[PDB]
Nucleic acid binder design. Structure first.
Lengths: 555, 412
DNA sequence: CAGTCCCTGTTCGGGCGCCT
DNA sequence: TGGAAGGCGCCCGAACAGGGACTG
C-alpha cells in the first residue's frame, strides 16, 4: 500500500490504441551515472514503482544538464506515447505581461519544488509510463519502473498540473480576496497592499496551505528582494524591464543567425521603441537551408545598426493603474512598418511594439493603419481587458473620406489626431462624376492564352489613338496596361472607360503600394493627375469606342 | 426528479474544440458572477483538462437591457447535433406568423434550466472563462442542464412547452406562437393594447409554470421589399447611358426579358462621357418596356425548405445598407434596404451588426431559419468588434467577401 | 455548359524568440 | 553529444480555396 495526496485526473488513450514500446539510445556512462543516481532516489519518496514482465511497454530516457545549474536534469522522451495519448484542452491561454500588473506594496515570488513530481498520476494510466533503467554500458539489461506522478515530457502533464494547482489555490484566494496570485506553471507571484510584515505572514500561511497538499516551497524564493526575476523580466517597486538581451556580433552571417537575431529583436520590441526587422527578414526569402550563409545588404546593415543603437540605452516599463486611461500612439516607420507605444502618463511606457505585416498584393497606408489599430486593440484587451484611446498620424478628415467612401465596413475606435510626420494620407481620389472638357479614353487590352502575346491600347473622342504589342503577358496585365497608356498620354484631367472589372477593382481601392511594378507605375501616374474619372462598361456590347478599341487591340 | 432525453452527435463527428477569444474586463466580471451563481445552483459544474472539448463564451446586453446575459457560441456544437433537432424533436413553422399585424419576442431560455441534460452529452458543453492578463489559467465548466442557445434545448423542452401553452392556445385560438431557440415569437392582429396585454397574460402563464421573462416588438405586415429601379432623367449623357446599360445588363441575369440593344446603339461611337445624346424612339421604347419588366415578379422563385438561406449585404454609403436573401443565385426570396440604424454616419461595424440581426430576425419570422451571411468586411475587423454590438441570443453563420461595386444594382 | 487560367486571400507547418 | 512538454509571438513559403473571364 502507497499513500494518496490530492484528487486525481482520469486519463485515457486515443480509443483502440495501446501503450508505447521502444528501446533506448546508446548512451555514454556519463549520462547513465547521471541517471541511476536520481533513479534510486524517487523509489523511497513514492515517485516511482517497479514492474515485472507483466508490463508490456517500453520508452526511452536520457538526461540534459541544467542551464546555469549544478545537478543534472532528467527528461523522458514520450513522443510515441504522446501521439497515442488523448488530446487535452489546454488551460494555458497565453503569457502574463509585466505591463499588465498593478502597483503592489509587497511582492513575493515562489516556486513549487519538484512540481510535476508532487502531483499523483491517474491510477489506471500509470502502467503506460514504462521506461527501462540502465545500470551502465554492457553492464546489465537494467530495471524497469513506472511513474506514480506526472513525468517531465508527457503531453498531459502541464494541463493537469496547472488545473490541479488552480483547484488547490482556489480556497486560499477565497479566504484572501485581496491578495493577488499570478499562477504560471509552477511559478507563483503573490502580491498585496499589506505591510511587509503581515505580508510575510500571509505568505507563510500560503506555504503551509500548499503543504497540506504536499506541495513544497523551497527557499529559492525571492523574499523582499527587488528586482524579482519573473517571466524573463525584472520587477522593481515602480518599474520593470526585460532581462538583458545579448545580440550576436558575428562577422559571418548565416541564415539561422539572422533568425536568432530577428527573434531577439522581436522580443526586445515590447519595450525598446522603434525596432525594425524588415530588411533583415528580407534576407530569409526562399533560402535553401538553415545552414546557408548570406551577406548583409547595405539596407540590412543600416537597420541592424540603428537597432543596436536603440539597444544601447537602457529602458524600463511601468505598471498599470486602472484609475488612469490607457493610450496607444502609432508612428509610421516607412516601407509598411509601424511602431506603437502604450502608456498612461506621458512618456512613461507600459509597453511598446511593432506591426510590420503586409496584407494583399495592393494596399495603402490607411488600410495598414487600420490593421495596426486592430492588432493593438486585441493585444490591449488580452492584457488590461480594455481598449486604449488611440493617437494616430492621420487627419480626421482623411479618415472620414476613406471610411465613408470605401465599400467595406471599416472602423477605428475612439482616437485623436497627433501631428507627427510622416502623416498618413490618401494619395489620389477618383472623381464621382465624368469630367466636363476632359479627353475620354476608351481603353482595352487582350492577350492570347497560347502565345501569351497581347495588345493594349486606346481610342479617344478627339481621334487620338494608340496600340502597343506586348509579349508574354495576360489579359489582366493588358487591361492594366491599357489604363496605364491612357494615363501617360493624357493631360491633368482624364476620363477613362474600361471593361476590366479586375483593373477597376484594384484602382478604386486607392492603393499607394503594390507588389506589382505595373500597378506602382499606374499609381505614380494617378498621383500626378488633377482629376481622374474611371468608368466601367460591359464588353462585347459593342459599347462606344469600346467595340472599336475591342476591334483595335485584337487586330 | 426528471428523466433525461439522451442525445448523440451527428454520425461520425467529434465534439466542438474552439478556442476562447479574449474578453473585456466588464465581460469577464459579469461572466465570473453569472457562473458562480449558476454553480451554486447546480446548472453548471467545474471540470478539468481531461475534457478535450471547448466552446466560446461571452456576454451581451439585449437592447435597452442594462443586465448582463451569458451567451455561448454553440454554432459548432449545433452543426454537430443538427439531425437531432432538425429530424427528430423539431418544431413546425407557422406561415401565418409573418402575416400577423404584430409579433413580440420573449426570452424563455430560463425554462431550459429545469430539465436535466443527458449525462453522456455534457462533456460537449465545455466552456472556459479566461482571465485578464492570464493571471489565472482558464476556469472550465460544463452544463448540467439544458444550455441556453443550444439547438437541442428547445427540442427537448418542446413537450413541456406546449404543455404550458395549451391553456393559452385554447383561450386565444387565433394568436400564433413560434419557438426559435431561446425565443418565443407571439403574433396577433389585435390592436397594440390588447396585444401587450395578452403578452403579459402569457408571461403569467410562464411564471406559475416555473419560468421568467426579463420582449421586442415586430410588425411584419409592414416589412418592405426593395425593387430594382432605373433613373428618370430629362437628358442623358454618354456616361448616363453607359451606366444604365451596365445596370440593365446585370439585371438581365435576373429578369431575362431585359434588352440593351436599342440603348447600346446610342453608344455606338467614341464620344465624350459628358456629351448629351437624345434617346431614339426605339431606345425610349426599350427603356420603358424595361421599366415594366422590373415591376413584374421574378419567375420560378419559391422557398425550398431543404436548402440554406444565403444573405448578402452591401454598404451603400450615407448609412444605407441593401441586402438580398436567396437560396439560388438570382432567385431572391427577399430584398431590402436599411437606413439610419444605430451607428449611422459614425460606426460601420455597429450598423453592420444591427443589419445582420434585423435580417436574421426577419428570416426566423418568415422561414423559421437563420441565413448564412456574406459580410462586406475584413475578417479581422469584424472579429475584433462584433461582440461589442451583439444584442441577440442566437449567432448566425458568416463568411467574409470583398466585392467592389462596378454597378450599383441595389440602390439608385 | 464543364474545364482551364489567372489572380488574390487564407490557412497551415516549420523555423526562431521567450516562459515554466 | 543529436535529443521532452505545453503556451504565446514573428516571418516565410507552399497548399488549398475560391471568383470571374475565356474557351472547348
Amino acid at each position: 500500500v502507497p499513500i494518496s495526496p490530492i484528487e486525481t485526473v482520469p486519463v485515457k488513450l486515443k480509443p483502440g490504441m495501446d501503450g508505447p514500446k521502444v528501446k533506448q539510445w546508446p548512451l555514454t556512462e556519463e549520462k547513465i551515472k547521471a541517471l541511476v543516481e536520481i533513479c534510486t532516489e524517487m523509489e523511497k519518496e513514492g515517485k516511482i514503482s517497479k514492474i515485472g514482465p507483466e508490463n508490456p511497454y517500453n520508452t526511452p530516457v536520457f538526461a540534459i544538464k541544467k542551464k546555469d545549474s549544478t545537478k543534472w536534469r532528467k527528461l523522458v522522451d514520450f513522443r510515441e506515447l504522446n501521439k497515442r495519448t488523448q488530446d487535452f484542452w489546454e488551460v494555458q491561454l497565453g503569457i502574463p505581461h509585466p505591463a499588465g500588473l498593478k502597483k503592489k506594496k509587497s511582492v513575493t515570488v515562489l516556486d513549487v519544488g519538484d512540481a510535476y513530481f508532487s502531483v499523483p498520476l491517474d491510477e489506471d494510466f500509470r502502467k503506460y509510463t514504462a521506461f527501462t533503467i540502465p545500470s551502465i554500458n554492457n553492464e546489465t539489461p537494467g530495471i524497469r519502473y513506472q511513474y506514480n506522478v506526472l513525468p517531465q515530457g508527457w503531453k498531459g502533464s502541464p494541463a493537469i498540473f496547472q488545473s490541479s494547482m488552480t483547484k488547490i489555490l482556489e480556497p486560499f484566494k477565497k479566504q484572501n480576496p485581496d491578495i493577488v496570485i499570478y499562477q504560471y506553471m509552477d511559478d507563483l507571484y503573490v502580491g498585496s497592499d499589506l505591510e511587509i510584515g503581515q505580508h510575510r505572514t500571509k505568505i507563510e500561511e500560503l506555504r503551509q496551505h500548499l503543504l497540506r497538499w504536499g506541495l513544497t516551497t523551497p527557499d529559492k524564493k525571492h523574499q523582499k528582494e527587488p528586482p524579482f526575476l519573473w517571466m524573463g523580466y525584472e520587477l522593481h517597486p515602480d518599474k520593470w524591464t526585460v532581462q538583458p538581451i545579448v545580440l550576436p556580433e558575428k562577422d559571418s552571417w548565416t541564415v539561422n543567425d539572422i533568425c536568432k537575431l530577428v527573434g531577439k529583436l522581436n522580443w526586445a520590441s515590447q519595450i525598446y521603441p522603434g525596432i525594425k526587422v524588415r530588411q533583415l527578414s528580407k534576407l530569409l526569402r526562399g533560402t535553401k537551408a538553415l545552414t546557408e550563409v548570406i551577406p548583409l545588404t547595405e539596407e540590412a546593415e543600416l537597420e541592424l545598426a540603428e537597432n543596436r543603437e536603440i539597444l544601447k540605452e537602457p529602458v524600463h516599463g511601468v505598471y498599470y493603474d486602472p484609475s488612469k486611461d490607457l493610450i496607444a500612439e502609432i508612428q509610421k516607420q516607412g516601407q509598411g512598418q509601424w511602431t506603437y507605444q502604450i502608456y498612461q502618463e506621458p512618456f512613461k511606457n507600459l509597453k511598446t511594439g511593432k506591426y510590420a505585416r503586409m496584407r494583399g498584393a495592393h494596399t495603402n497606408d490607411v488600410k495598414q493603419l487600420t490593421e495596426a489599430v486592430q492588432k493593438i486593440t486585441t493585444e490591449s484587451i488580452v492584457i488590461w481587458g480594455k481598449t486604449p484611446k488611440f493617437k494616430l498620424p492621420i487627419q480626421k478628415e482623411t479618415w472620414e473620406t476613406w471610411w465613408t467612401e470605401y465599400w467595406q465596413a471599416t472602423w477605428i475606435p475612439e482616437w485623436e489626431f497627433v501631428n507627427t510626420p510622416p502623416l498618413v494620407k490618401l494619395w489620389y481620389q477618383l472623381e464621382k462624376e465624368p469630367i466636363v472638357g476632359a479627353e475620354t479614353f476608351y481603353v482595352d487590352g487582350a492577350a492570347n492564352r497560347e502565345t501569351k502575346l497581347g495588345k493594349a491600347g486606346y481610342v479617344t473622342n478627339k481621334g487620338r489613338q494608340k496600340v502597343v504589342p506586348l509579349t508574354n503577358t495576360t489579359n489582366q496585365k493588358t487591361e492594366l496596361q491599357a489604363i496605364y497608356l491612357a494615363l501617360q498620354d493624357s493631360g491633368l484631367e482624364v476620363n477613362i472607360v474600361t471593361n476590366s472589372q479586375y483593373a477597376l477593382g484594384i484602382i478604386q481601392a486607392q492603393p499607394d503600394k503594390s507588389e506589382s511594378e505595373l500597378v506602382n507605375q499606374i499609381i505614380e501616374q494617378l498621383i500626378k493627375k488633377e482629376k481622374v474619372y474611371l468608368a466601367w462598361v460591359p464588353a462585347h456590347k459593342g459599347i462606344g469606342g469600346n467595340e472599336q478599341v475591342d476591334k483595335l487591340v485584337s487586330a | 426528479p426528471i428523466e433525461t432525453v439522451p442525445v448523440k452527435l451527428k454520425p461520425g463527428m467529434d465534439g466542438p474544440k474552439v478556442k476562447q477569444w479574449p474578453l473585456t474586463e466588464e465581460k469577464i466580471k459579469a461572466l465570473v458572477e453569472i457562473c458562480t451563481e449558476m454553480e451554486k445552483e447546480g446548472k453548471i459544474s467545474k471540470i478539468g483538462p481531461e475534457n478535450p472539448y471547448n466552446t466560446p463564451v461571452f456576454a451581451i446586453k439585449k437592447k435597452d437591457s442594462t443586465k448582463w446575459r451569458k451567451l455561448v457560441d454553440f454554432r459548432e456544437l449545433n452543426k454537430r447535433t443538427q439531425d437531432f433537432w432538425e429530424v427528430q424533436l423539431g418544431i413546425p413553422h407557422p406561415a401565418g406568423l409573418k402575416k400577423k399585424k404584430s409579433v413580440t419576442v420573449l426570452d424563455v431560455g430560463d425554462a431550459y434550466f429545469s430539465v436535466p441534460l443527458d449525462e453522456d452529452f455534457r462533456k460537449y458543453t465545455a466552456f472556459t472563462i479566461p482571465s485578464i492578463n492570464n493571471e489565472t489559467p482558464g476556469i472550465r465548466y460544463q452544463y448540467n442542464v439544458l444550455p441556453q442557445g443550444w439547438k437541442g434545448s428547445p427540442a427537448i423542452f418542446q413537450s413541456s412547452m406546449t404543455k404550458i401553452l395549451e391553456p393559452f392556445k385554447k383561450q386565444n385560438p387565433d394568436i400564433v406562437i413560434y419557438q426559435y431557440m431561446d425565443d418565443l415569437y407571439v403574433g396577433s392582429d389585435l390592436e397594440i393594447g390588447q396585444h401587450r396585454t395578452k403578452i403579459e397574460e402569457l408571461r403569467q402563464h410562464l411564471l406559475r409554470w416555473g419560468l421568467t421573462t426579463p420582449g421586442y416588438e415586430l410588425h411584419p405586415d409592414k416589412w418592405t421589399v426593395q425593387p430594382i429601379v432605373l433613373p428618370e432623367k430629362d437628358s442623358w449623357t454618354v456616361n448616363d447611358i453607359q451606366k444604365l446599360v451596365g445596370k440593365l445588363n446585370w439585371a438581365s441575369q435576373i429578369y431575362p426579358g431585359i434588352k440593351v440593344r436599342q440603348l447600346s446603339k446610342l453608344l455606338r461611337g467614341t464620344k465624350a462621357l459628358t456629351e448629351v445624346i437624345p434617346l431614339t424612339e426605339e431606345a425610349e421604347l426599350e427603356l420603358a418596356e424595361n421599366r415594366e419588366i422590373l415591376k413584374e415578379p421574378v419567375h420560378g422563385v419559391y422557398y425550398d425548405p431543404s436548402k440554406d438561406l444565403i444573405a448578402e449585404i452591401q454598404k451603400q454609403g450615407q448609412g444605407q445598407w441593401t441586402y438580398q436573401i436567396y437560396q439560388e443565385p438570382f432567385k431572391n426570396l427577399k430584398t431590402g434596404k436599411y437606413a439610419r440604424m444605430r451607428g449611422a454616419h459614425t460606426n460601420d461595424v455597429k450598423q453592420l451588426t444591427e443589419a445582420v440581426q434585423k435580417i436574421t430576425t426577419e428570416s426566423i419570422v418568415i422561414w423559421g431559419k437563420t441565413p448564412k451571411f456574406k459580410l462586406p468586411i475584413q475578417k479581422e475587423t469584424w472579429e475584433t468588434w462584433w461582440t461589442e454590438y451583439w444584442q441577440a441570443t442566437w449567432i448566425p453563420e458568416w463568411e467574409f467577401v470583398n466585392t467592389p461595386p462596378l454597378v450599383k444594382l441595389w440602390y439608385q
